[PDB]
Design a protein around this ligand. Structure first.
Ligand SMILES: [Mg+2]
Ligand SMILES: [Mg+2]
Ligand SMILES: [Mg+2]
Ligand SMILES: [Mg+2]
Ligand SMILES: [Mg+2]
Length: 118
RNA sequence: CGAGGGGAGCCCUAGCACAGGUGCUGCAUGGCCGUCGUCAGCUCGUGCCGUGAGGUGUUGGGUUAAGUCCCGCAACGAGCGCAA
């Protein structure tokens, strides 16, 4: 169940352009291909489940960034049914570091959106 | 008993405190004026890069008289300026 679709077809993305810190995962080339690994995907993926479960049941606002091209439509739907904040189009320049200015822009958003009722 | 000690202030016969330069110095100052310029630029808070001056905001594309304001972009935004 948790390893069927992960093992069905999950290979082939941007080949012969690869940062060689990923080199311990590709195990076979046949003609011009580079295979994304499966068994280490299961183990590191399981470590990620047991990390975000134990870290996230306390009530952490676990944010996720899907700004590439086509994870925008999946982040934009899964974020409302998830209950956690998100980002739509691009990462804002210094979103966490300039949270004073961005958060006081949200403080402006708390009173500009109340103008519609008046 | 005022035209007697004189009396509120003033006047002086002539004094005396201090005043007095359309002469330099804006190469000691405050207010100023002209100037580039009615072109569209100049700064600040936060955060990043860089040992640093500093850059990033204020870069690239589009167009307007215009830093007027959109897309991406480590930038998000404010103040004086084109306006009202
Ligand atoms: Mg400048
Ligand atoms: Mg600069
Ligand atoms: Mg720009
Ligand atoms: Mg102009
Ligand atoms: Mg402006």
């Amino acid at each position: 169940v948790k390893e069927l679709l992960e093992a069905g077809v999950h290979f082939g993305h941007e080949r012969k352009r690869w940062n060689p810190k990923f080199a311990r995962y590709i195990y076979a080339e046949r003609n011009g291909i580079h295979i994304i690994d499966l068994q280490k995907t299961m183990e590191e993926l399981e470590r990620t489940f047991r990390f975000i479960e134990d870290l996230a049941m306390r009530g952490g606002t676990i944010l996720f960034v899907g700004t590439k091209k086509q994870a925008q439509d999946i982040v934009r739907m899964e974020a409302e049914r998830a209950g956690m904040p998100y980002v739509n189009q691009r990462w804002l320049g210094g979103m966490l570091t300039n949270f004073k200015t961005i958060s006081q822009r949200v403080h402006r958003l708390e009173e500009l959106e109340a103008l519609f009722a008046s």
